[PDB]
Structure formats: C-alpha cells, structure tokens
Amino acid sequence: IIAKQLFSSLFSGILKEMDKFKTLSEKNNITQKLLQDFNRFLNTTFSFFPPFVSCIQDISCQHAALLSLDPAAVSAGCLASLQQPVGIRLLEEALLRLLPRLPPDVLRWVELAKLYRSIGEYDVLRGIFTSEIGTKQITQSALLAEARSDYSEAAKQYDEALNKQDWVDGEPTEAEKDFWELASLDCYNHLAEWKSLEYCSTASIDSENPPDLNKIWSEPFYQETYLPYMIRSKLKLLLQGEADQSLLTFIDKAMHGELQKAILELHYSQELSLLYLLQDDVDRAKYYIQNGIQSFMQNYSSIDVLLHQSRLTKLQSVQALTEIQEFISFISKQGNLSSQVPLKRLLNTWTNRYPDAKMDPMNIWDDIITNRCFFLSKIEEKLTPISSLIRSCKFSMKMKMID
C-alpha cells in the first residue's frame, strides 16, 4: 500500500513539474505512449493484484487527458480484481470530458452499468437508463413497472418490446437489446417460473430446438452474463420433480475443461454440490461444501469494508451453505437413519429459523424455501424402513413464504 501511494505521489509530482518543461507538442506526443502502456497493463495482466490496479487508475484522475483509457479493459479488470469504486470514479470523471459492435463512446455508460451490477447499487442502475440513454417511450413504462416491483407487467412489456417488428419513430440500438435481455432475466428471476427463464436463456445463446447447453463457452460475453442464470434455472427445475439430466451431462464435460474447473470452483459450489446431491455423491458434495465455505470467505475478505450492500448480498448466501452442510451431516449417520428422534429436533431448528422477511429480498428467500422442500422430499425415502406431519410442515413453511 505504501509503495502504491508513493508511486502515485511521485508520478503526480513528475507530471506536474513536466509542465515546467512547458514545451507544448511533446506533451501531447508522450501522454500517448503513457496511455498505451497504461492500456497494455490491464490488457495483458493475469494476476490482477489489487493495489497495483488502484494505482493504475490513480494517475488517470490526478491529471487529465489520460481519461481516454479503453473502458472495457479497465472495467473487466475491476470486476475480476474487485476494487470497483475507483473504476466507478474513473469512468464517472471520464464521462465529464466532451469530445470534438457499439461505435459511440456511450459504451462507457453500459460498462458503468455492468460494474454497478457487480457492486450491487441497483437504484443507481435504474437511474442510469432512467437518465434517458436509449429513449423509446415503452422502456420508460417498463422501468416504472419493475420499479414498482410489478415484474409481471414488466415481463409482458419487455416481451412486446422484443417481438415488436413494426418499429417507428426510428429504431433502438442493440445495446438496449442486451439491456432488455438482462432485465428480462432479472425480472423472471424475481418471478420464479424458470421454465420461461430457461427458454429465454437457452434461445438467446444458441439455435437448436431441443435446447443446447454445450456451445456455451463459445465467447466471454456468454459466460460472464448468461451462465449463472442458466445454471440456476436448470437446478431449480431439476430439484422440483424430475426432467432431462442435460445439466449433469453438461457438467460432465465442464470438469474436463481445465479453465472451466477454475470458474466453477470460483463461483458455483452450491450449484455443483446440490446437483450432485441428486445422485447421492455425498463424498463429492461434502468436498464441494467445504470448498464453498472457502470461496465465500475469500470473496468476503476481498470486498471493501465501506460498502453495505455488497457485504449484505454476499452475507445472505451463507444461510443456504450452512443448511447444505447440516443436511449432508444428517444423511450419513445410521443412528439417525433407523431412529425417530433427530428429525423432530431438526424440524424445530428449521421452524425457528427464517431470514428476516423485511431485510432479505425474495431472490434468496425462495432459494431457502426450495432447498428445505427438496430436503424433506428427499429424506422421505430413507425413513420408511408421525411420518405424515413431515408432509404437513411444508404447508406452514410455505405459509411463511406467502406472508
């Protein structure tokens, strides 16, 4: 940290006293070389060491004329290495200076929007496109409907915005097409019903009519936006009833790809663990859960201390991880397999344990409810070798759901 701060201070001093050199053309000549090197750092690095990056932005806003840095590279480096707020400020300040698959420099806006998605300041996220970048009236009413949390109306309005072909008063741009797809993903995720969410996620990526999954990993856009919604929807479909094991055959090839193993161990421990719990690979699931604990600690340790929303969003998830651990602990013990006692205690603990229902949004309340429902439906099988009230507890627990 002290080295970073010293480098920034000395560089600022050198650049400002270069104005004492004051010869006029070479400064514009050499700020170029500086900015290409600054670009290449983010363009080629693979460690993304945070304080180095924070330094790399620090020079940019101290002086001017260095703010023309490539938005996508610095933004993606920020999402990879965290340290988002300095990137937030850098793009924010770069948007001040007017200038004499997306041509316009407006892409600063969409990069900032993706980055705000990463930090989780969602209100400003609406404010970005409420700030009227990409105007055609129906979008405003769609933002209104989703702001009222009326995702049902927003779904139809977005769908009619996509299927509208008699466009008049001009045309929207494909950046708003991407925004519409992402907003549809979000509002469907707030509405469950993931069958349509699956259909949209699969269709927006690939053609084939029995839906494909394997040709994901074709471009980085696809993975870094559509992979999570896809996997979440398939898991939540599979855990309710039963359907095609395409996700299982999918992860069967996902592991053998070495680079894919890194992403999956980085972001989807819950997913793989619970999916394996379908096929009783409890040994693998236990490994995945201890690894998920590590992933959560590392992620939480990495995030900055001054951001309430990001910390809260990361924190809420541990409630499900602890339950997975508890369930896998309960599965493997013959003293509980053949007896009647522990299930009542477990039900007691679950019935005096629910997330806040005012603090915690639906997108995780539904998750905890669904995991409990699956847990009991699965445990029903092993008890057979009083049993009715287990079926009943789902009713009260979903009454708390509804309330």
Binding site: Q290, I293, M297, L315, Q316, L321, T322, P355
Partner: protein
C-alpha cells in the same frame, strides 16, 4: 444457567475474549464454543437484543486468507459455519456498526 440470569454482565468478557482471540487462538475457540452453547440453550427473545454487540467484533476473524492445537483454518471455517447457522435474521447485525452512520473514524483527511 449462569448466562440466563444476566447477559449484559458477561457480554464485555466475551467481547474481549474473541477480540484478543486473533492473537492467541484458544480464547477464540472457547468463545466460539460459548456462542452456540448459549444460542441452543438460552431463550431467543432474552438474547436477541444482545446480538447487536456480540457479532460485530467477530468480523475481524474474516479478514485474511492467504493460502499448537488450535489453528486459524479450523476457527475460520467454524466461525463461518456459526455466523451462517445462527440465522439470517440474526447475522444481519454483523456490520461494523449495525444500521448506523457513525463510522467515518479513520476515514478523513
């Protein structure tokens, strides 16, 4: 039983315990045993107001990951397990000060 006749009394003791626990682990281990031994036994309402001070000082354990009978990895995994299994409605209060504006100490020119 001693912890249900009064709790404010022992809260500072627990606070110092898992505050100094970062330097010498067995105090952290003992305090993070007392936590569940309290939670599973004491009435929820009796302890619920107390959580506003019990958890916030525990965030220090969640700082560094860079990969004797008490180790950092065991206490870290166990404390994550504890702060999760204690309840969402409960661990909501983990922030440095829970739902307050007071904290810009050490963050001013």
């Amino acid at each position: 039983n001693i912890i249900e006749l009064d709790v404010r009394a022992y809260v500072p003791a627990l606070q110092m315990a898992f505050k100094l626990g970062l330097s010498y682990t067995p105090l952290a281990e003992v305090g993070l045993n007392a936590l569940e031994e309290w939670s599973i036994y004491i009435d929820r309402h009796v302890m619920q107001p107390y959580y506003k001070d019990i958890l916030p000082c525990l965030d220090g354990y969640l700082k560094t990951s860079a990969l004797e009978a008490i180790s950092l990895e065991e206490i870290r995994i166990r404390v994550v397990q504890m702060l999760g299994s204690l309840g969402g409605q409960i661990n909501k209060n983990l922030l440095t000060v829970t739902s307050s504006d007071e904290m810009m100490k050490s963050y001013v020119a």
